[PDB]
Amino acid sequence: VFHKIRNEDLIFNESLGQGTFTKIFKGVRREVGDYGQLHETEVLLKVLDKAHRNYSESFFEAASMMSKLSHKHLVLNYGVCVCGDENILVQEFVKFGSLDTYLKKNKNCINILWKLEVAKQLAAAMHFLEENTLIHGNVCAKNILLIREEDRKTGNPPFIKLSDPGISITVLPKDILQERIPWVPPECIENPKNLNLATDKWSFGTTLWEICSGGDKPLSALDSQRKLQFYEDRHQLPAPKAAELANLINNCMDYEPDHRPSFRAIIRDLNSLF
Numbered sequence: 001v002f003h004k005i006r007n008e009d010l011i012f013n014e015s016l017g018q019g020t021f022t023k024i025f026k027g028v029r030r031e032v033g034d035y036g037q038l039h040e041t042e043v044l045l046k047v048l049d050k051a052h053r054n055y056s057e058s059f060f061e062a063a064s065m066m067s068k069l070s071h072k073h074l075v076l077n078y079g080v081c082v083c084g085d086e087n088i089l090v091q092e093f094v095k096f097g098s099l100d101t102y103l104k105k106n107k108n109c110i111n112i113l114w115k116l117e118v119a120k121q122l123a124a125a126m127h128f129l130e131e132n133t134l135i136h137g138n139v140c141a142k143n144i145l146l147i148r149e150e151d152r153k154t155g156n157p158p159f160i161k162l163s164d165p166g167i168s169i170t171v172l173p174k175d176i177l178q179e180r181i182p183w184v185p186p187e188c189i190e191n192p193k194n195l196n197l198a199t200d201k202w203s204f205g206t207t208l209w210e211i212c213s214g215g216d217k218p219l220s221a222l223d224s225q226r227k228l229q230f231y232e233d234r235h236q237l238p239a240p241k242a243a244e245l246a247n248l249i250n251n252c253m254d255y256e257p258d259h260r261p262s263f264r265a266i267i268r269d270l271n272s273l274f
């Protein structure tokens, strides 16, 4: 199902961080492109920790998810590297990296109309998954990649893409899920089998909170057991200073999954701002 790329066509360079049970690297891919021309393509190389190769089917399923469909806001997958004892995804390389990084570093420079722009693009991506009845399962600012930055001359907005969700929370071990509170919904903490489309509405609300808070991670001062108890007492996240989106956030982060608004409704809400 995955296109096969030979290890000798791939150079592994700098380390770009890690995900849950994964390492990610900037790489270079030599390939034949349109019109027969040879190219050196920057790629993202994503390697599943060999200590955790038992999650490999989830690893590769989460990727084929993003390539079932084609959409302008979904990161492209190029294939899998065929090299022996290893599990390596080859993906589009996004130059400006993760949204959470970019929010922390540019906290000052971001205004309400940049949040709103990014928030809209994300909602358009989620709307598109919605219509296809496709669950992402791991919406968060770190899984949003900045294709391009705002341009203060052309007035052109940033453009973001959504990364694949990684190993699924249906198989991940319980303390990973609990540390992912409050991106993981209450119903999924209670039972990961409760993964639904309404999962992504909650996480979207958490991601909007991240976007309005300049790289702050919600509930970060709270250890695991307190995160759990936050959900027992049915608390809501604090209103972000930039508070234009607090009501939308709370509306998405509804403890009742069936009451979370559709992304069509969310987009209307976002489009009704001055």
Ligand SMILES: NC(=O)Nc1cc(-c2cccc(F)c2)sc1C(=O)N[C@H]1CCCNC1
Pocket (backbone or CB within 6 Å): 016, 017, 018, 019, 020, 024, 044, 075, 091, 092, 093, 094, 095, 096, 097, 098, 142, 143, 145, 163
């Ligand atoms: N495709 C691509 O460029 N990805 C990509 C590019 C990143 C990046 C790009 C430029 C500079 C830099 F420091 C990092 S980070 C990242 C990524 O996908 N990170 C994972 C880590 C944890 C959760 N899943 C997101």
